[PDB]
Write a protein that binds this DNA or RNA. Sequence first.
DNA 1: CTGACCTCATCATTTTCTTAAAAACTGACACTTACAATGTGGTCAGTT
DNA 2: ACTGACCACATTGTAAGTGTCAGTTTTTAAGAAAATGATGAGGTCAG
Lengths: 431, 443
Amino acid sequence: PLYEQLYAHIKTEITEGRIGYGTKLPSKRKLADSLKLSQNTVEAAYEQLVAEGYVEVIPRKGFYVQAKQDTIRYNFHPTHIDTTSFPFEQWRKYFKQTMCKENHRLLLNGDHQGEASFRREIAYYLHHSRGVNCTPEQVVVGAGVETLLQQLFLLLGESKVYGIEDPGYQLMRKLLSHYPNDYVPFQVDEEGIDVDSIVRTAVDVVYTTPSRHFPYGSVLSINRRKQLLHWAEAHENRYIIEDDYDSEFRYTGKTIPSLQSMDVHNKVIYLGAFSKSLIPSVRISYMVLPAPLAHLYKNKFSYYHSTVSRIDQQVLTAFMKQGDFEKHLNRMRKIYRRKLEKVLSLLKRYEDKLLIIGERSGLHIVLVVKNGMDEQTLVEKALAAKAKVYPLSAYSLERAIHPPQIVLGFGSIPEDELEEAIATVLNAWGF
Amino acid sequence: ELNRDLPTPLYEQLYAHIKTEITEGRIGYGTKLPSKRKLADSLKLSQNTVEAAYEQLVAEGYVEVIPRKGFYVQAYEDLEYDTIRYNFHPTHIDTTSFPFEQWRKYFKQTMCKENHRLLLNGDHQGEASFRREIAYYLHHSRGVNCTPEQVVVGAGVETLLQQLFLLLGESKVYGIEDPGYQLMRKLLSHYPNDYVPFQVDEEGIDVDSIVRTAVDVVYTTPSRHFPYGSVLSINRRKQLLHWAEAHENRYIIEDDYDSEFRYTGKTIPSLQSMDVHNKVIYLGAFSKSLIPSVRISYMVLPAPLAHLYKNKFSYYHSTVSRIDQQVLTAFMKQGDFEKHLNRMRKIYRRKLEKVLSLLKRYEDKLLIIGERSGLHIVLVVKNGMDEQTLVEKALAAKAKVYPLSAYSLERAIHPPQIVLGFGSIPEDELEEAIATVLNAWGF
DNA sequence: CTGACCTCATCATTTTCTTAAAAACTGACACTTACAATGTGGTCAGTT
DNA sequence: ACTGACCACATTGTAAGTGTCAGTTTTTAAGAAAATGATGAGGTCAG
């Protein structure tokens, strides 16, 4: 339009320098007549110019110029949950129920921790499922476990030591790489972590997964748990973090109570996750904190907002306020149990070479290969067979184990393709 | 003793009994259990339930079984040892004008049974679609020149700023605007880094003080200055760009607050447009325009800093859900964003004109410092009373207001100056709101 | 030989799953009205 | 005499609206049917 065409047509002379600073622009009320353009167009162009300060105007009118991967048939790892059996038509029914024109004032942020209903529901569910004592005020909610962990890191300080078990999930190493703190490895036997090693050391906060040990699946006894609680009881400024990795997926023996139940003097914090059950890409997590530390955190981090969208909070609290969470959880448990039974029975024949180690509960198995080939050749053959696999040597930074044990997960593989996938992998290995 | 009437099966009551007997201390270390047959006969129960309870006990660790022999306890216990009627933020966006029924259609179009293989996460940089449409929108609305692969996505501005802080280092010295938007100081209050406060006049940041000091990175808004609405001139922009160019380890960050709501003067080109030396990083927002509660944002980087960010944070995962990301990609793909933006622009212009015209009459004791563009206006009360008394009297009539005392490190003017916003006040209530607040005050 | 590891059988109560018709829904083309955009023309107060 | 800003009214065309319709979708009380806690009677193998 001419409205800004004149603006550009004159801006070219101010920028290029047809007239220097202080020189008058061609005219006022006369340039319009000479160019035949209407006066209003000139007025608009000059106002646009003085908006950006290309030309400065004296109060009385004078013009002062200014100077994942592309080709994979399959992939194996415990991260990928199964996705086909998600009841979309049950999610949409609550979504269209929660976001309606009538219900405004849910589009603006508030309750910096999270929606009060969501916190109350989480407290009730945790207390009546995992035996975890809690309070509605006690819980905090954020998006991704990473943000909660970084909040904890900034809350504690840069003057503490962290204990990470060597065969484990490569998270705390990657977080502590950036931060000043340093980590101390710890080996783990078939009954738990080397609590004797910890009590023979001056570590302060240690990262453990009592319910199920990634990836070997070992379950901590009561004696070692009691010893660890007494170890935390000794001093006044030591804390133990409990990670709820993959509970509620145990088949035979119900499920094991969480370590937070044993806490009586407030030295255990309950960390959890929410995106390895419902959706891998919905990004909700949660955390509980002991009364003094939670009170301090409330008094310390007032100015942050929530991190996960309020829409998701409301829709999901309405989703599992009615009770569909139990139904979905049970259906997933059944399908995963059947998948695991089929895979184990299929692989049972090659028992001389493949010793399955671990326990049934979980979403994955770890298998040791007694063949003479090297693990690099194994993974390269798997990828060259259009079915990539993820070895365990990356999950532990110590010396590579001579028997190359390769991790296998099956959440991604469809129920009807399990046998074909296993057959293709084993044919690739040359059996 | 045993009810048999509780919903929990004997498969659990037997466990409860044995657990309380072991933990109370009536069975010691290494003691023999009655195995399966004897206990099953004595308790007139099936073998299956007994073996299930015993195997479950073994799994949790109380007792250990040696094959073809009896159980043996492995559990030696030492036991322990008032009523806000009219909100006033210069941050709220209107709710009623929001087309929900256009959101719903895209939501139902994107998430279906066929659309699996999307619940699984990935591409923490953001799927190439969302990036390419956001880059195209920025290029054709703000004159910003950057390929799609530079941009990133994160949940809000705070997370992006924390990632940038970790990426750059703790040795730098940061610069902020005048007493104003209280974000960077609140973030740096927890980090070793330090900030150098500044003063700005009615035209913009004093670039001379910048060039006479050795600050490393300085934070300011080229398009609209919170809360005075000042616009930086071309001369000061050029001088700031030269100052950033002068050294080789100094960066300028650009934060456009509401640079798309300029009513008359089209859209002022963004500072990134003039950068040819690759020294500015763009910071935007999707939450001061569309929804203030979905928590989305975006940010742009130059090529070497892009490589550094790629090599440094390659093992994170985005905090923005793929559901919202894809549905909003579809939202802007067909052009509905422009229509929504225009509608909001027009309604906000009407609201501003109405409120200004209403406030015109009482010009004797009050003034208007803010300019036309923006979502809020700054006024001074020349009544002989302190700001805190005005705020508490505002509370006294169930209509609270938020002054500039918290915004200001110093004391600007003894006659209090107070910020008012109108994002969440309906059109047919502005007159009543202003009337009741003026009644609460001396007028 | 009594002692203890184990695998099927088939019984039961109470939760999950499937099919139809009857309900409310919302995309597609259509058209009737607006309405704020630029734009021209002709004013205005008050300087100097 | 040189130039502040405030009306008129003209135009194109995007946005705003009600209309009946063809059309995918949602709700319901059945129906049926999977699964588990439970009783039974066995399989081998040791010492």
